[PDB]
């Protein structure tokens, strides 16, 4: 009974002070899925300094300056998105949690997306020059097409609609970074930068769970709403995704057209847009033509993360 006549501290801080606060109870758990997720993400802890990025130097050096600039720029753009999710997106989910363990899981997510951003830094430190690193930061700041994407999602985190925030949260690991992740998988399919792709697979091992978990929590909340409100939220999800696809296409054409990779990158992106919708409980409208990924690239995408790079 104590649980039903008390609130978690975050509920007390922001929503309701009619009752006293309860400490987190890990001994009687409301949702077994939370313990499962907690155990999986904590057991998957890793740091980028355990992966030997120096072994990419031979294949890195065979790439010309334009290819090296593209990689640096693409990765710095991905770093921006992780900075958004670490410092705003994931932490904004904590107060809207259904369960106590979920509050701690989103804290873990925010930290681990921080590590993802840190790992690009370790790649740049090993492979890139000081001038390449600085140019890419300049390029990210001045790229309106790049900037438009996080600019569209951030307002949902700072506003007071929890479901819209949760959708925006899941749209980051579930969709937005895949246009960029195409490049390292394109490269490693041609034997280029293999140790970098190991870092990308570790990042993806986390982001796949982040997307699933937010989608899972989204479905639980919207299931309680009226059919009218469910229909309103479905409309919002497709409207937002349609907008984000439009912005993503413009960014990826700008990023990849000179290398001839934009159409493949967009199909790679739309494949994951379908998976994003599936993880929110909706059907994907995209055709097999629209979501076609080349076998060699999909092999790099779906390859298992190496457990030798784990912390323990």
Residues 44-63, interacting with its own copies (CB under 8 A): 45, 47, 50
Q: How far is CA 121 from CA 2, 46, 115, in A?
A: 47, 15, 10
Q: Does 260 bind Ca ion (CB under 5 A)?
A: yes
CB of 9 to Ca ion, least distance (A): 27
Listed residue (182, 165, 17) closest to 84, CA to CA: 165
Helix residue spans in the chain (DSSP H): 9-14, 32-43, 57-62, 65-84, 90-93, 100-127, 130-142, 144-158, 162-171, 178-189, 194-222, 227-256, 262-279, 295-302
Interaction between residue 40 and its own copies (CB under 8 A): no
Q: DSSP of 287-311, one letter per residue? A: -TTTT---HHHHHHHHSPPPGGGS-
* Residue 116 assigned ligand-binding role: no
CA distances from 210 to 113, 118, 249, 290 (A): 10, 18, 24, 25
CA-nearest of 138, 211, 148, 144 to 181 is: 211
Q: Which of 274, 106, 99, 215 is nearest to 223 (CA)?
A: 215
110 touching its own copies, by CB under 8 A: yes
Nearer to its own copies, 222 or 252 (CB): 252
Residues 11 and 88: their CA atoms lie apart, in Å, by 19
Work out which of 34, 100, 198, 206 binds its own copies, going by CB under 8 A. 100
Binding of residue 294 to Ca ion (CB under 5 A): no
CB of 128 to Ca ion, least distance (A): 7
- The count of residues in the chain is 312
Q: Is 118 a binder of its own copies (CB under 8 A)?
A: yes
Residue 8 as a binder of its own copies (CB under 8 A): the answer is yes
Is position 120 annotated as part of the catalytic site? yes
Q: Does residue number 191 form part of the binding site for Ca ion (CB under 5 A)?
A: no
Should residue 159 be labelled a site residue for its own copies when binding is judged by CB under 8 A?
no
Shortest CB 126 distance to Ca ion, Å: 6
Out of 3, 14, 106, 120, pick the active-site residue. 120
Told to check if 108 binds its own copies by CB under 8 A, we report yes
Which of 56, 60, 71, 157 binds its own copies (CB under 8 A)? It is 157
The response to whether 16 counts as a known ligand-binding position is no
Q: Pick out residues in 99-128 that bind Ca ion (CB under 5 A).
A: none
Q: Residue 21 forms beta bridges with which residues?
A: 7
**Does residue number 84 form part of the binding site for its own copies (CB under 8 A)?**
yes
260 known ligand binder: yes
- Ligand-binding annotation for 210, yes or no, is yes
User: Known binder of ligand: residue 125?
Assistant: yes
Under the rule (CB under 5 A), what is the footprint of Ca ion? 260, 263
Binding-site residue ranges for Ca(2+): 49, 125, 260, 263-264, 296
């Amino acid at each position: 009974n104590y649980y039903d006549r008390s609130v978690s501290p975050v509920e007390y801080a922001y929503f309701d002070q009619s009752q006293n606060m309860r400490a987190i109870n890990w001994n009687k758990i409301v949702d077994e899925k939370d313990l499962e997720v907690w155990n999986r993400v904590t057991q998957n802890f890793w740091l980028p300094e355990n992966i030997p990025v120096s072994n990419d130097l031979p294949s890195w050096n065979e790439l010309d300056d334009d290819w090296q600039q593209l990689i640096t720029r693409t990765f710095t753009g991905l770093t921006l998105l992780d900075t958004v999710q670490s410092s705003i997106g994931d932490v904004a989910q904590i107060k809207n949690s259904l369960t106590e363990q979920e509050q701690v899981i989103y804290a873990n997510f925010a930290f681990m997306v921080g590590v993802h951003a840190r790992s690009y830094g370790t790649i740049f430190s090993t492979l890139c020059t000081s001038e390449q690193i600085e140019e890419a930061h300049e390029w990210v700041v001045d790229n309106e097409a790049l900037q438009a994407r996080p600019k569209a999602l951030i307002p949902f985190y700072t506003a007071d609609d929890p479901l819209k925030s949760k959708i925006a949260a899941a749209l980051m690991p579930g969709f937005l970074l895949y246009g960029g992740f195409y490049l390292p998988f394109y490269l490693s399919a041609r034997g280029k930068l293999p140790n970098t792709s190991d870092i990308i697979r570790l990042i993806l091992r986390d982001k796949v769970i982040h997307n699933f978990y937010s989608g899972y929590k989204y479905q639980l909340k919207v299931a309680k709403l009226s059919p009218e409100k469910q229909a309103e939220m479905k409309q919002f999800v497709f409207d937002l995704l349609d907008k984000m696809i439009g912005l993503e296409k413009t960014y990826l054409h700008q990023l990849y057209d000179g290398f001839g990779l934009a159409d493949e990158a967009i199909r790679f992106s739309l494949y994951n847009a379908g998976k994003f919708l599936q993880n929110l409980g909706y059907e994907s409208p995209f055709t097999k033509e629209e979501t076609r990924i080349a076998p060699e690239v999909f092999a790099q995408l779906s390859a298992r993360a190496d457990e030798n790079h784990d912390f323990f």
